[PDB]
């Protein structure tokens, strides 16, 4: 055995009962992927993607403080997900690529297809494209890493494509902006975002939902559609589509998201669960409550957002946790969820249990209006920021792996941590 499969079919029963018992028992599993191990350098900008018993990983290592440090290394790797022997899954890396200049690579994203990962990624000499947006050249790079490297074989193991032809429509720029994507047949879909000049953004403020929000003004979401109300651009999430069956390697197409539940363009994720794609979008604006759901159509993109009333994200100012009313802000965090059962929608993710600060990461199995069960991944006072969760099967048992950026209690340096959590069957 020792083989990891995607969640498909009727997995072994999980606990469907809301409980307080400490039935979730996480495993720290980051020791077989030793890339993370470090002593005080800051590791940031994490990427974990899993598909079909393989995975993609990435981080950026900066010398100095996590916020003003200097980029030292960019690592983009791929490997296999296997049972280490005790019926616990763990990541083992097979192929690593180090970009020549770390200061050019931003906002990578990964999609698996037929024994390769493709990591679409943004190239910028002006800085972070989101922060210095009007000057970003707009260029994109496509790396392709083989999950099964072959000895003395080049252009199979690693291959770089320059995307000359970008179909952007009305947008000036498009960009990978999310960890994970899906494959459908021969075509790859990356979570992406588009930069649209605000004065070309057609919106009626009569469409802003100010119901039960006395203190909210109708322009608010029209304004909060960019990082500042002034912003030359607004951001709109969607997908970057890449058809491998296309003759040339140049063309990549943008697909915008529906105007349902529109929220500022956010780090997003499209993934496969139990037979359909589910789409998640981070909340960086007034709609703090989690937004993710089944994908009715990938192109055009329309997402059946769950009316979740229990899961949210922290926010320091003007958009704290549990805010459902339109306001101008650009704050939040990427804590995604991954569906485990669709018959009853039960999903798993690591969320920060705080109103304002980014502390107390908690692994949480929940339905729309209720949280079935929790397990705290660190002390309640522990500061952590971003969580990426993916779930799969191991001997038909549902397992998740969550990457959690966690801060040292004494150092203030942050490092990614890898937890494996088995969803139990029994509620005792």
């Amino acid at each position, epitope marked *: 055995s020792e083989g990891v499969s995607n969640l498909v079919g009727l997995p072994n029963n999980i606990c469907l009962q809301k409980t307080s018992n400490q039935i979730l028992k996480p495993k720290l599993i980051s020791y077989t992927l030793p890339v993370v191990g470090q002593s005080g350098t800051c590791i940031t900008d994490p990427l974990l993607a899993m598909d079909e018993g393989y995975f993609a990983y990435s981080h950026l290592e900066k010398i100095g403080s996590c916020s003003r440090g200097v980029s030292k290394q960019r690592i983009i790797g791929v490997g296999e997900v296997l049972d280490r022997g005790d019926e616990v899954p763990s990541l083992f890396m097979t192929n690593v690529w180090t970009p020549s200049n770390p200061n050019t690579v931003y906002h990578c994203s990964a999609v698996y297809n037929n024994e390769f990962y493709y990591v679409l990624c943004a190239v910028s000499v002006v800085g*972070d494209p*989101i922060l210095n947006s009007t000057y970003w050249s707009g260029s994109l790079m496509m790396t392709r890493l083989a999950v099964k490297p072959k000895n003395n074989g080049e252009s199979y193991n690693q291959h770089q494509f320059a995307l000359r032809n970008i179909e952007k429509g009305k947008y000036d720029k498009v960009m990978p902006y999310g960890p994970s994507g899906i494959k459908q047949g021969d075509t790859l879909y990356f979570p992406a975002v588009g930069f649209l000049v605000r004065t070309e953004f057609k919106y009626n403020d009569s469409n802003c939902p100010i119901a039960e929000c006395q203190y909210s003004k109708p322009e608010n979401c029209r304004l909060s559609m960019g990082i500042r109300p002034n912003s030359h651009y607004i951001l709109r999430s969607g997908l970057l589509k890449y058809n491998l069956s296309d003759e040339e390697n140049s063309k990549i197409v943008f697909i915008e998201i529906s105007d349902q539940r529109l929220s500022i363009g956010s780090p997003s994720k499209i993934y496969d669960s139990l037979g359909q794609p589910v789409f998640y979008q981070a909340s960086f604006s007034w709609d703090t409550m989690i937004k993710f759901g089944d994908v009715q159509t990938v192109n055009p993109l329309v997402v059946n957002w769950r009316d979740n009333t229990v899961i949210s994200r922290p926010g320091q*100012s003007q958009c704290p946790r549990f805010n459902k009313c339109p306001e*101008v802000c650009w704050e939040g965090v990427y804590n995604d969820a991954f569906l485990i059962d669709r018959i009853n929608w039960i999903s798993a993710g690591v969320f920060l249990d705080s109103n304002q600060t980014a502390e107390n990461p908690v692994f949480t199995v929940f339905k729309d209006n209720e949280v079935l069960y929790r397990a705290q991944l660190a002390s309640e006072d522990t500061n952590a920021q971003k969580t990426i969760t993916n779930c799969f099967l191991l001997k038909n048992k549902i397992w998740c792996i969550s990457l959690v950026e966690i*801060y040292d209690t004494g150092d*203030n340096v942050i490092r990614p941590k890898l937890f494996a959590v088995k969803i139990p069957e029994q509620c005792t």
Partner: antibody
Amino acid sequence: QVQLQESGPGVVKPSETLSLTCAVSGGSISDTYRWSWIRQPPGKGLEWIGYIYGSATSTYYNPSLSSRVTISKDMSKNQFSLNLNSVTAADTAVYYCARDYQYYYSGSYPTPHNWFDVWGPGVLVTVSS
Amino acid sequence: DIQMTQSPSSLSASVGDRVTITCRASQGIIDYLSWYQQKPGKAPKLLISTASNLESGVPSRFSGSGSGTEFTLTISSLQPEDFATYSCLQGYTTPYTFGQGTKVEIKR
């Protein structure tokens, strides 16, 4: 060169409303995200009263004062105003106009580091009958 | 709000000394501490941002460190110019909070 200047009565009667107005010269209010009012009682630490959005209607107030405090703006003059009702002698203080700076490092990490990069000279308001 | 307990409230050192002011936070503010200097009848000047970063034009003798809950500003060689009430600003969650300030005096 961007600069601030506070204008105010200097003395307020107890139990009546204090008001102050900051004039911004060297740049428009519509160019900076948040502007704020903060105060320092004599022989005591700095307190942060609250902010107004530079180019939006949004406001945030310190909950020690939220019931009493109203922060407004006049874009035609580059002015923004503080109105602190029902003043107690505890509210005698030097009041500083100030503007806010936000430092970001990554566009997939919207957690700005906040501080105040430009201040006014400060105006003392006394709360005495 | 997050309270900042700054200490010592007062201080006095000869020129050429090393001064250390420290400041703790009710909760964890990772890297979100600003260190300010204010001189009589003037506005506050920012010396340190993001815990350890000297702002341009500020002497090298000013230095800042942090553990998330304890934050220490160090003046390596006190000079006559550096006499002021020094202050904390936690710039993470709103309401923003200031330390109570500490008055560095010089001995002669």
